[PDB]
Amino acid sequence: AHMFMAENRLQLQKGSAEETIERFYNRQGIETIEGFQQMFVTKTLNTEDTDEVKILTIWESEDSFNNWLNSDVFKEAHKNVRLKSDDDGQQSPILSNKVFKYDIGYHYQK
Amino acid sequence: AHMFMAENRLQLQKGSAEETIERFYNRQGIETIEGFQQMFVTKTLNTEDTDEVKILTIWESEDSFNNWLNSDVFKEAHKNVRLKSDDDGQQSPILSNKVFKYDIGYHYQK
Numbered sequence: 563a564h565m566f567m568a569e570n571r572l573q574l575q576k577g578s579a580e581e582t583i584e585r586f587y588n589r590q591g592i593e594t595i596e597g598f599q600q601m602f603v604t605k606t607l608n609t610e611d612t613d614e615v616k617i618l619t620i621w622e623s624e625d626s627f628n629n630w631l632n633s634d635v636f637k638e639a640h641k642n643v644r645l646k647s648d649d650d651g652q653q654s655p656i657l658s659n660k661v662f663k664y665d666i667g668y669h670y671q672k
Numbered sequence: 673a674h675m676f677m678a679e680n681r682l683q684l685q686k687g688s689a690e691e692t693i694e695r696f697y698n699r700q701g702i703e704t705i706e707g708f709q710q711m712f713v714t715k716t717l718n719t720e721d722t723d724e725v726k727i728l729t730i731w732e733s734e735d736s737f738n739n740w741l742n743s744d745v746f747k748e749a750h751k752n753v754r755l756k757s758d759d760d761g762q763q764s765p766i767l768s769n770k771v772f773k774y775d776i777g778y779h780y781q782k
């Protein structure tokens with residue numbers, strides 16, 4: 563079976579990538595889901611408009627990822643997360659998210 | 673120092689993702705580059721008119737990637753690569769490519 567990747571792509575106010583990335587430093591349970599393998603948190607370089615941060619999660623299968631989405635740990639990690647558009651979210655630099663899903667056709671680790 | 677990711681995004685004619693991914697199975701020298709750590713080749717899951725394949729390379733530093741990009745082994749790996757838009761690109765399903773660069777702010781591997 564091929565590995566699977568899920569990306570959450572954060573659209574952020576200009577300059578807010580760093581303060582946003584720091585929120586991802588301490589784990590909140592994703593690592594306890596069977597089939598979770600790796601996570602990367604990236605800042606897109608050379609952006610001229612909004613900042614862009616991507617959260618890449620690598621899994622044994624799409625099923626594993628779905629299991630995390632359906633978990634209480636997913637809820638607990640996101641319980642205080644607000645978009646700028648939320649009623650109490652005016653101060654958030656997070657404008658929107660978009661999820662992308664991928665089949666990993668090849669992987670190599672040195 | 674932060675890890676670094678360079679991505680080559682390929683826009684491909686519909687149905688050609690699988691045949692294109694197979695071209696990346698066999699290494700052509702990138703593994704010999706000091707600082708090279710991982711590579712992923714992905715197919716985006718969606719309902720679009722074109723296929724999309726991304727090549728993600730993970731490095732100890734941006735310097736590492738620059739060394740590879742400017743290397744003889746990079747040149748060799750790509751010497752027979754053509755785009756559909758090229759004069760001799762008749763058999764190529766590759767419509768275009770775009771490079772994206774990222775600082776890796778955080779990484780976790782189970």
Ligand code: HEM
Pocket residue numbers: 568569570585586588589590591592593601617619635639640643644645656658659661
């Ligand atoms: C609904 C929109 C979402 C927004 C605005 C958002 C943003 C955030 C933020 C700000 C954090 C850190 C929270 C904190 O300060 O403690 C977080 C946690 C996290 N998010 Fe999201 N997120 C969303 C949904 C998703 C989705 C769909 C994914 C799938 C890739 C994802 C992946 C992650 C991961 C892997 C963590 C860390 C989880 C852990 O350590 O257990 N998020 N998210």
Ligand code: HEM
Pocket residue numbers: 678679680695696698699700701702703711727728729745749750753754755766769771
């Ligand atoms: C100029 C546009 C490019 C196109 C159309 C392209 C497409 C391709 C193709 C089709 C292959 C496999 C060739 C074969 O059949 O042997 C390949 C090799 C490869 N490409 Fe690209 N590529 C381009 C530039 C880049 C860039 C900028 C990167 C940076 C991430 C990259 C990353 C890779 C990697 C890691 C390999 C495998 C190299 C090895 O194993 O040593 N390519 N590319």
Ligand SMILES: [C-]#N
Pocket residue numbers: 570571572617
């Ligand atoms: C969460 N991204």
Ligand SMILES: [C-]#N
Pocket residue numbers: 680681682727
């Ligand atoms: C090369 N992608």
Ligand SMILES: [Mg+2]
Pocket residue numbers: 577609
């Ligand atoms: Mg900037």
Ligand SMILES: [Mg+2]
Pocket residue numbers: 610611
């Ligand atoms: Mg502007």
